[PDB]
Short mmCIF file of all heavy atoms in Angstrom, two decimals:
data_model
loop_
_atom_site.label_atom_id
_atom_site.label_comp_id
_atom_site.label_asym_id
_atom_site.label_seq_id
_atom_site.Cartn_x
_atom_site.Cartn_y
_atom_site.Cartn_z
N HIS A 199 -28.83 33.96 -23.10
CA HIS A 199 -29.12 34.93 -22.05
C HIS A 199 -30.53 35.40 -22.32
O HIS A 199 -30.77 36.46 -22.87
CB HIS A 199 -28.12 36.07 -22.10
CG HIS A 199 -26.70 35.61 -22.05
ND1 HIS A 199 -25.96 35.37 -23.18
CD2 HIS A 199 -25.91 35.29 -21.00
CE1 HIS A 199 -24.77 34.91 -22.84
NE2 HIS A 199 -24.71 34.85 -21.53
N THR A 200 -31.45 34.50 -21.98
CA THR A 200 -32.88 34.66 -22.17
C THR A 200 -33.45 35.99 -21.68
O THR A 200 -34.22 36.64 -22.39
CB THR A 200 -33.58 33.48 -21.51
OG1 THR A 200 -33.00 32.26 -22.01
CG2 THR A 200 -35.05 33.49 -21.81
N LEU A 201 -33.11 36.38 -20.46
CA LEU A 201 -33.59 37.63 -19.90
C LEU A 201 -32.83 37.99 -18.63
O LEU A 201 -32.13 37.15 -18.05
CB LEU A 201 -35.10 37.56 -19.62
CG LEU A 201 -35.72 36.81 -18.42
CD1 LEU A 201 -35.42 37.50 -17.10
CD2 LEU A 201 -37.23 36.77 -18.61
N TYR A 202 -32.98 39.23 -18.19
CA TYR A 202 -32.36 39.69 -16.96
C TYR A 202 -33.28 40.68 -16.27
O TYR A 202 -34.11 41.31 -16.92
CB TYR A 202 -30.98 40.31 -17.21
CG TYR A 202 -30.90 41.37 -18.28
CD1 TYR A 202 -30.76 42.71 -17.93
CD2 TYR A 202 -30.90 41.04 -19.62
CE1 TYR A 202 -30.60 43.70 -18.91
CE2 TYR A 202 -30.74 42.01 -20.60
CZ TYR A 202 -30.59 43.34 -20.24
OH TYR A 202 -30.43 44.30 -21.20
N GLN A 203 -33.19 40.74 -14.95
CA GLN A 203 -34.03 41.64 -14.17
C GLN A 203 -33.20 42.58 -13.29
O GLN A 203 -32.20 42.16 -12.71
CB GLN A 203 -35.00 40.83 -13.30
CG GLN A 203 -35.96 41.70 -12.51
CD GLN A 203 -36.87 40.92 -11.59
OE1 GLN A 203 -36.98 39.70 -11.69
NE2 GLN A 203 -37.54 41.63 -10.68
N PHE A 204 -33.64 43.83 -13.17
CA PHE A 204 -32.98 44.85 -12.35
C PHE A 204 -33.70 45.02 -11.01
O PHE A 204 -34.91 44.82 -10.94
CB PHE A 204 -32.98 46.20 -13.08
CG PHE A 204 -32.00 46.29 -14.21
CD1 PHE A 204 -32.43 46.35 -15.53
CD2 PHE A 204 -30.64 46.35 -13.95
CE1 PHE A 204 -31.51 46.46 -16.58
CE2 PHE A 204 -29.72 46.47 -14.98
CZ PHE A 204 -30.16 46.52 -16.30
N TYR A 205 -32.96 45.43 -9.98
CA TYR A 205 -33.53 45.61 -8.64
C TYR A 205 -32.79 46.72 -7.88
O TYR A 205 -31.56 46.76 -7.87
CB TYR A 205 -33.45 44.28 -7.88
CG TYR A 205 -34.03 44.29 -6.48
CD1 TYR A 205 -35.34 43.87 -6.24
CD2 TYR A 205 -33.24 44.63 -5.38
CE1 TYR A 205 -35.84 43.78 -4.95
CE2 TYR A 205 -33.75 44.55 -4.08
CZ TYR A 205 -35.04 44.12 -3.88
OH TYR A 205 -35.53 44.04 -2.59
N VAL A 206 -33.56 47.58 -7.23
CA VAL A 206 -33.02 48.72 -6.49
C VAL A 206 -33.45 48.75 -5.03
O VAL A 206 -34.64 48.61 -4.72
CB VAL A 206 -33.51 50.04 -7.12
CG1 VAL A 206 -33.07 51.23 -6.29
CG2 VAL A 206 -33.00 50.16 -8.54
N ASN A 207 -32.48 48.93 -4.14
CA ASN A 207 -32.76 49.04 -2.71
C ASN A 207 -31.50 49.54 -2.01
O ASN A 207 -30.39 49.26 -2.45
CB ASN A 207 -33.21 47.71 -2.09
CG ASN A 207 -34.01 47.90 -0.81
OD1 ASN A 207 -33.74 48.80 -0.02
ND2 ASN A 207 -35.01 47.06 -0.60
N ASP A 208 -31.70 50.34 -0.96
CA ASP A 208 -30.60 50.91 -0.19
C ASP A 208 -29.65 51.73 -1.05
O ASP A 208 -28.52 51.98 -0.66
CB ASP A 208 -29.81 49.80 0.53
CG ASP A 208 -30.65 49.04 1.54
OD1 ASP A 208 -31.23 49.70 2.44
OD2 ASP A 208 -30.74 47.80 1.44
N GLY A 209 -30.14 52.18 -2.20
CA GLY A 209 -29.31 52.97 -3.10
C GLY A 209 -28.40 52.15 -4.00
O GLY A 209 -27.53 52.70 -4.68
N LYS A 210 -28.61 50.84 -4.05
CA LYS A 210 -27.76 50.00 -4.87
C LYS A 210 -28.56 49.25 -5.89
O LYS A 210 -29.71 48.87 -5.63
CB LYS A 210 -26.94 49.05 -4.00
CG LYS A 210 -26.12 49.80 -2.96
CD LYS A 210 -25.73 48.95 -1.77
CE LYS A 210 -24.44 48.19 -2.03
NZ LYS A 210 -24.03 47.43 -0.82
N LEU A 211 -27.98 49.07 -7.07
CA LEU A 211 -28.62 48.36 -8.14
C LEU A 211 -28.01 46.97 -8.25
O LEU A 211 -26.80 46.81 -8.13
CB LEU A 211 -28.41 49.09 -9.46
CG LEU A 211 -29.09 48.42 -10.66
CD1 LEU A 211 -30.48 49.03 -10.86
CD2 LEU A 211 -28.25 48.59 -11.92
N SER A 212 -28.86 45.96 -8.41
CA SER A 212 -28.41 44.59 -8.56
C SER A 212 -29.05 44.09 -9.85
O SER A 212 -29.94 44.75 -10.39
CB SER A 212 -28.89 43.73 -7.39
OG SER A 212 -28.16 44.03 -6.21
N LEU A 213 -28.59 42.95 -10.34
CA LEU A 213 -29.15 42.38 -11.56
C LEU A 213 -29.07 40.86 -11.49
O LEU A 213 -28.10 40.32 -10.97
CB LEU A 213 -28.42 42.91 -12.80
CG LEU A 213 -28.57 42.19 -14.15
CD1 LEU A 213 -28.67 43.17 -15.29
CD2 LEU A 213 -27.39 41.28 -14.36
N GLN A 214 -30.14 40.21 -11.94
CA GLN A 214 -30.19 38.75 -11.98
C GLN A 214 -30.35 38.37 -13.44
O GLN A 214 -31.13 38.98 -14.17
CB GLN A 214 -31.36 38.19 -11.18
CG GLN A 214 -31.50 36.68 -11.33
CD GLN A 214 -32.27 36.01 -10.21
OE1 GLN A 214 -32.02 34.86 -9.90
NE2 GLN A 214 -33.21 36.72 -9.61
N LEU A 215 -29.60 37.35 -13.85
CA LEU A 215 -29.62 36.88 -15.23
C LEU A 215 -30.16 35.46 -15.24
O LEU A 215 -29.96 34.71 -14.28
CB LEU A 215 -28.18 36.86 -15.74
CG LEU A 215 -27.78 36.87 -17.22
CD1 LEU A 215 -26.66 35.86 -17.43
CD2 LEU A 215 -28.95 36.60 -18.15
N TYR A 216 -30.91 35.13 -16.29
CA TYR A 216 -31.42 33.77 -16.47
C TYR A 216 -30.81 33.29 -17.79
O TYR A 216 -31.15 33.79 -18.86
CB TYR A 216 -32.95 33.72 -16.53
CG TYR A 216 -33.45 32.30 -16.57
CD1 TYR A 216 -33.65 31.58 -15.39
CD2 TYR A 216 -33.56 31.61 -17.79
CE1 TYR A 216 -33.93 30.21 -15.41
CE2 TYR A 216 -33.84 30.23 -17.82
CZ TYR A 216 -34.01 29.54 -16.62
OH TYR A 216 -34.21 28.18 -16.61
N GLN A 217 -29.86 32.36 -17.69
CA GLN A 217 -29.16 31.80 -18.84
C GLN A 217 -29.60 30.33 -19.04
O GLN A 217 -29.16 29.43 -18.32
CB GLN A 217 -27.65 31.88 -18.61
CG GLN A 217 -26.80 31.33 -19.74
CD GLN A 217 -25.33 31.70 -19.62
OE1 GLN A 217 -24.95 32.59 -18.85
NE2 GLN A 217 -24.51 31.03 -20.40
N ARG A 218 -30.43 30.09 -20.04
CA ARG A 218 -30.96 28.75 -20.29
C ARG A 218 -29.91 27.66 -20.46
O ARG A 218 -30.13 26.50 -20.09
CB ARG A 218 -31.87 28.75 -21.51
CG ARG A 218 -31.15 29.14 -22.79
CD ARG A 218 -32.08 29.16 -23.98
NE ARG A 218 -31.34 29.28 -25.22
CZ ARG A 218 -30.64 28.29 -25.77
NH1 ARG A 218 -30.62 27.10 -25.19
NH2 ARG A 218 -29.98 28.48 -26.90
N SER A 219 -28.75 28.03 -21.01
CA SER A 219 -27.70 27.06 -21.27
C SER A 219 -26.34 27.68 -21.02
O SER A 219 -26.12 28.84 -21.38
CB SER A 219 -27.80 26.62 -22.73
OG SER A 219 -26.83 25.64 -23.04
N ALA A 220 -25.42 26.92 -20.44
CA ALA A 220 -24.10 27.46 -20.14
C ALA A 220 -22.95 26.47 -20.22
O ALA A 220 -22.98 25.41 -19.57
CB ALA A 220 -24.11 28.14 -18.78
N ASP A 221 -21.96 26.82 -21.03
CA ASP A 221 -20.73 26.07 -21.25
C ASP A 221 -19.83 26.54 -20.10
O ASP A 221 -19.25 27.63 -20.17
CB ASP A 221 -20.16 26.50 -22.61
CG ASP A 221 -18.83 25.84 -22.94
OD1 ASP A 221 -18.11 25.40 -22.02
OD2 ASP A 221 -18.48 25.81 -24.14
N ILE A 222 -19.71 25.72 -19.07
CA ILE A 222 -18.95 26.05 -17.87
C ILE A 222 -17.47 26.44 -18.02
O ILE A 222 -16.97 27.27 -17.26
CB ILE A 222 -19.11 24.94 -16.79
CG1 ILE A 222 -20.57 24.88 -16.35
CG2 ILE A 222 -18.24 25.22 -15.56
CD1 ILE A 222 -20.84 23.88 -15.26
N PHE A 223 -16.78 25.86 -18.99
CA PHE A 223 -15.38 26.19 -19.16
C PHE A 223 -15.13 27.41 -20.03
O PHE A 223 -14.51 28.38 -19.59
CB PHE A 223 -14.59 24.99 -19.69
CG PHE A 223 -13.10 25.23 -19.73
CD1 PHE A 223 -12.40 25.59 -18.58
CD2 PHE A 223 -12.39 25.13 -20.94
CE1 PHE A 223 -11.03 25.84 -18.61
CE2 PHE A 223 -11.03 25.38 -20.99
CZ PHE A 223 -10.35 25.74 -19.82
N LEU A 224 -15.63 27.38 -21.27
CA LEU A 224 -15.40 28.47 -22.20
C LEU A 224 -16.39 29.64 -22.19
O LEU A 224 -15.99 30.78 -22.45
CB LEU A 224 -15.28 27.94 -23.64
CG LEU A 224 -14.19 26.93 -23.99
CD1 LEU A 224 -14.14 26.73 -25.50
CD2 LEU A 224 -12.84 27.42 -23.50
N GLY A 225 -17.66 29.36 -21.90
CA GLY A 225 -18.66 30.41 -21.90
C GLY A 225 -18.89 31.19 -20.61
O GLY A 225 -18.90 32.42 -20.61
N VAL A 226 -19.13 30.48 -19.51
CA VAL A 226 -19.39 31.14 -18.24
C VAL A 226 -18.41 32.26 -17.80
O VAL A 226 -18.87 33.31 -17.34
CB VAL A 226 -19.63 30.13 -17.09
CG1 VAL A 226 -19.76 30.84 -15.74
CG2 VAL A 226 -20.91 29.37 -17.34
N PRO A 227 -17.07 32.08 -17.99
CA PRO A 227 -16.14 33.15 -17.58
C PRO A 227 -16.42 34.48 -18.29
O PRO A 227 -16.19 35.54 -17.74
CB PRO A 227 -14.77 32.59 -17.95
CG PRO A 227 -14.98 31.12 -17.99
CD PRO A 227 -16.33 30.98 -18.62
N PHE A 228 -16.93 34.40 -19.53
CA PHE A 228 -17.28 35.58 -20.31
C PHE A 228 -18.63 36.15 -19.86
O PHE A 228 -18.76 37.36 -19.60
CB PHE A 228 -17.40 35.22 -21.79
CG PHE A 228 -16.10 35.29 -22.54
CD1 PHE A 228 -15.12 34.32 -22.36
CD2 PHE A 228 -15.89 36.29 -23.47
CE1 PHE A 228 -13.95 34.35 -23.09
CE2 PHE A 228 -14.72 36.34 -24.21
CZ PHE A 228 -13.75 35.36 -24.02
#
């Protein structure tokens, strides 16, 4: 989980994550 960015608009907070590598079965659900 290399980094993540926050964003605010219309009174709501969102977040985007940049994950360099991901194990689709065991890791991603977590």
Side-chain angles (χ1 to χ4, degrees):
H199 306 93
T200 307
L201 76 70
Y202 52 106
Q203 183 183 347
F204 285 111
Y205 182 95
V206 175
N207 203 325
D208 297 304
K210 303 158 87 176
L211 181 93
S212 287
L213 164 141
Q214 174 159 210
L215 201 223
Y216 185 86
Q217 180 168 344
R218 63 181 191 74
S219 182
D221 177 338
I222 296 183
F223 187 57
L224 300 189
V226 175
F228 273 73

